[PDB]
Amino acid sequence: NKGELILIKEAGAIRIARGVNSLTELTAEKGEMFQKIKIVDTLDIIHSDI
Amino acid sequence: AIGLPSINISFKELATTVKERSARGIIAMVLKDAKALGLNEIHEKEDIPVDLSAENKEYINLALMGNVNTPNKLLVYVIEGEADIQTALDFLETKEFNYLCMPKAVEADKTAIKNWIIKLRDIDKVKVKAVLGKVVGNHEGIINFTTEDVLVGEKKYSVDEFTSRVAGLIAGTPLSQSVTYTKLSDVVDIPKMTKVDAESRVNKGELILIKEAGAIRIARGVNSLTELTAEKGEMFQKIKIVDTLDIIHSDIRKVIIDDYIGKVTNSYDNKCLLIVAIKSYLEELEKSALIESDSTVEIDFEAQKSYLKSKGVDLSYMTLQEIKEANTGSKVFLKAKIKVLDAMEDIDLSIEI
Amino acid sequence: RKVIIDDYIGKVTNSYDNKCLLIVAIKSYLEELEKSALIESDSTVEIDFEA
Amino acid sequence: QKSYLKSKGVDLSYMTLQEIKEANTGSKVFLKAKIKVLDAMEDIDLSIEI
Amino acid sequence: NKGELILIKEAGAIRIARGVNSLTELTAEKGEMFQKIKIVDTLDIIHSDI
Question: Which family does it belong to (chain C) (predicted)?
């Protein structure tokens, strides 16, 4: 919940626990989805290509 | 907030539900003794507290024998001698029941019980009944069985002692059938008495035992009230009709208080939903063949108009539909029409050659 | 009279279908009696409308 | 609003209702509204005739 | 009926008496079938596999 990225032991092996970004405050401009790595990455590649 | 990934599997049961309605077939039994005082909760025929007297055990045994089936639940409360009746009466008002009876009682006790029943059926809006040895109480709440020197099992029984057997016989029967003309294999003789006398006693609201056909049978079990007002019609004199009316009242009141009291807003659509629920219950009851097939429920109109006029609102121009639209403020007015069936009692057959 | 008092008194609700069932039972008894050759073959029983 | 305009001494005898509503008030707003508040069902009266 | 599992001498040998579960109260969602060992066991295996 702090935006911290951690490593968790669960099930058989060691797995990453819900990779999220570092930002914590959500403005009316910067919505929730800007916290996911995958979404920000696809936005970046779209920007670069266009 | 973003948390750890959630994977959850939930298992639930298909809670197939039939609504629990008010219990019918319970008997309130009161008796005086110095042992096992208070309620005794004889739910099962076999088990009986042992410290009770043998004669009182015989009274219980007369109480247990059901008409078609055993009574659903028997509640016997033991009271200390000379403790008056009110001490037991509050105890009984604490819990629910259907029929009450006293084998041993003086006429003062019967007067107290009849006054209690009349006040409770109209003040507290609770429908209960009781059988008394010999009273001329003119209410629907009491049934006056009167027959002297009843011989059961080589033993003489007065009317007051036999009232227990009468109450058990009444509670045994289902609501579909009636009590009239039911065999009592236990009794073996009654003092002889003519048919016109039976007509006279029955016309008095008295309940009588008759010797007819091969066996010994009840002769047209009726209520105790005799005067017929413009309010209380003839049908209020039959045990079956008043009993099904009591059941209807209890079920409707329980539903209303349990769900629609203080939990839904008073608006027209909520009124329609309540009407639909009431009609659904009535149709469900009709399926069991206690009332006629077609019944109607509709919001009362004249009472609503009178209530609005009592508030000073001007209702001259608003249409009847708009009148039903009007807000009432936590008050609901409804009227419903039903037709109650009865068991076959008199058959007239005409054959020509 | 014996059949009526034994089965249909104080045990059946007064309704149209119950009356039809009583009619059917009475007609069945009449047909059974007809088999013993005491009455003519065809007999009719129905609800008394005038009364 | 009419009373307030009278209080400042304006002569509104000829001015019509809409024109009275049109007049400037100077940072003053006067509004009135009507509503009807619902309540939960509390008393139920059911009448049955047999 | 008290939710206890008991050992009974009946027929030729000593046998289990209707192996049932320890829960006794019945709620709206916990129905009758949740009292059987076999049913709860197969439910558990379904949960784990899925």
Answer: Belongs to the myoviridae tail sheath protein family.
